[PDB]
Each structure stands twice: as C-alpha cells, then as structure tokens.
Design a protein around this ligand. Structure first.
Ligand code: COA
Ligand code: HQG
Length: 180
C-alpha cells in the first residue's frame, strides 16, 4: 500500500521548492505535465508503484487542498519558494483574515509586519481554527494574529487566490495586524 501522506510531502517538495531536482520545469502558474512528475518520482524506489490514479487519490484523501490536477497537468496551489514568482490571480480579500504564528516571531512581526520569509507570498487563513493549526506547526501555544485585510487591500496591499482556506498576500505592514 501507498503512504499517501508521505507521497504528498514528496510532491510538495517537487512542486513548491525544488522542481529542478526532479528534472522538472514549472510553468508560470506552477503547472507541470503529470507524466513528467510520475517519471521523476519513479527514480525513487519508494515511489515506483505510484500511478496517475494514485495522485488523484492522494488529493481526494488529503485534509487540505494542496494540489490540483487538470488536463493531465498538476500544480501546487500555494507554498512555493522558487525564484520565479508563481503568477496567482489577484483578489479582493474578506474584511478579516487570520495568521497563526509562533511566540518567538511576534516581536519581529510587530516591528516589520508579516513578510513572505522563505516563500513567495505571505500565507493567511480564513478562520481562527485553521490559523491556529498553522501556528501549531511551530509552537504548542501559537499566537493568533488578526489581519484587517480589506483595509490593507484598500491601501494598496495585494492579495491573491490560494484556495478557500489559504489566502496569499504581499508583505503586510504591521498597522494592519492585531496582536491582541
Ligand atoms: S527516494 C528519493 C526521495 N526524494 C528525495 O530524496 C529528494 C529530496 N527529499 C526530501 O527533501 C524529503 O524526503 C521530503 C520529500 C521533503 C519529505 O521529508 P519530510 O518527511 O521531513 O516532510 P515534511 O514533514 O518536512 O513536509 C514536507 C512538505 O510537505 C507538506 N505536506 C504535504 N502533505 C502533507 C501531509 N499529508 N501531512 C503533513 N505535511 C504535508 C508539508 O507541510 C511540507 O510543506 P513545506 O512547503 O516544506 O513547508
Ligand atoms: N517579519 C517577520 N519576522 C519573523 N517571522 C515572521 C515575519 N513574518 C512572518 N513570519 C513568520 O515566518 C514563518 C514563515 O513560515 P512559513 O513560510 O512556513 O509560513 P506559514 O507558517 O504561514 O505556512 C505556510 C503554509 O504551509 C503550511 O501548508 P501545508 O501544510 O504545507 O500545505 C501551512 O498550513 C500554510 O498554509 C511563519 O511562522 C510567519 O509567522
């Protein structure tokens, strides 16, 4: 049987972080031919059994909509770190978005605002529980930040489509972030 969770982590690395290591090139919106991905995964002993059907199943069973398959191509919807900016659709955000973080980063976010750091975009959540889960990746007592996203947008900060639970933004100045 396939560990679809571990397969999902491998696909994340290929489609967000190091496509070159797989001999892949992503298009401007992040897509690659799914047969080229499968061929690359089959260089790895653990993934030689993985079929195109398995990639659909991995997506269906996942707790998050990380990837999409369309007309024989696959992309990650968010998370990228590669030098070439992934073109995402600009969108007007809801009034409020959230961002869960680690206690150890709060001072720096107060001073500088939210920054993309190792990714191309700041990632934000649509609801509190989702944001706390983001923060739990780094801190058992994560900090919830509340972003006045529509105010930021009206003052020129760009936001972009990730998926229904993950919104993307350029750097967000501190004045739009509530820490309490
Ligand atoms: S046999 C040859 C295998 N391939 C290679 O050797 C090439 C380089 N391999 C690697 O770098 C690692 O083996 C990878 C593929 C990254 C897997 O290592 P980890 O077990 O440590 O994975 P992480 O926990 O660090 O997470 C990796 C990214 O995957 C996201 N993710 C996708 N799907 C899930 C699921 N179901 N559950 C948890 N996390 C998942 C992770 O959030 C993470 O995302 P980042 O963008 O890296 O933050
Ligand atoms: N000025 C500043 N100074 C200091 N620290 C600052 C800072 N600005 C921001 N930070 C913090 O710098 C960390 C960046 O960390 P990340 O790149 O991993 O971003 P993120 O945590 O949002 O996570 C992305 C997605 O990854 C996962 O998705 P998957 O499961 O992989 O699909 C999640 O669920 C997400 O959707 C975060 O703590 C920021 O708060």
């Amino acid at each position: 049987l396939i560990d679809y969770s571990k397969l999902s982590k491998e696909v994340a690395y290929a489609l967000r972080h190091a496509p070159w290591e797989y001999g892949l090139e992503l298009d401007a919106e992040g897509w690659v031919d799914i047969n080229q991905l499968l061929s690359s995964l089959h260089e790895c002993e653990k993934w030689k059994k993985v079929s195109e059907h398995d990639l659909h199943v991995m997506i269906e069973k996942s707790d998050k909509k990380r990837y999409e398959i369309s007309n024989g191509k696959i992309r990650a919807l968010y998370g990228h770190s590669i030098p070439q900016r992934i073109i995402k659709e600009q969108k007007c955000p809801p009034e409020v978005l959230y961002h869960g973080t680690a206690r150890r980063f709060v001072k720096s976010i107060k001073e500088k605002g939210l920054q993309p750091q190792g990714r191309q975009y700041v990632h934000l959540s649509a609801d509190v529980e989702t944001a706390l889960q983001v923060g739990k990746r780094r801190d058992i007592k994560p900090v919830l930040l509340i972003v006045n996203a529509l105010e930021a947008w009206s003052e020129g900060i760009k936001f972009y489509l990730g998926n229904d639970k993950v919104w993307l933004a350029d750097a967000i100045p501190s004045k739009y972030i509530r820490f309490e």
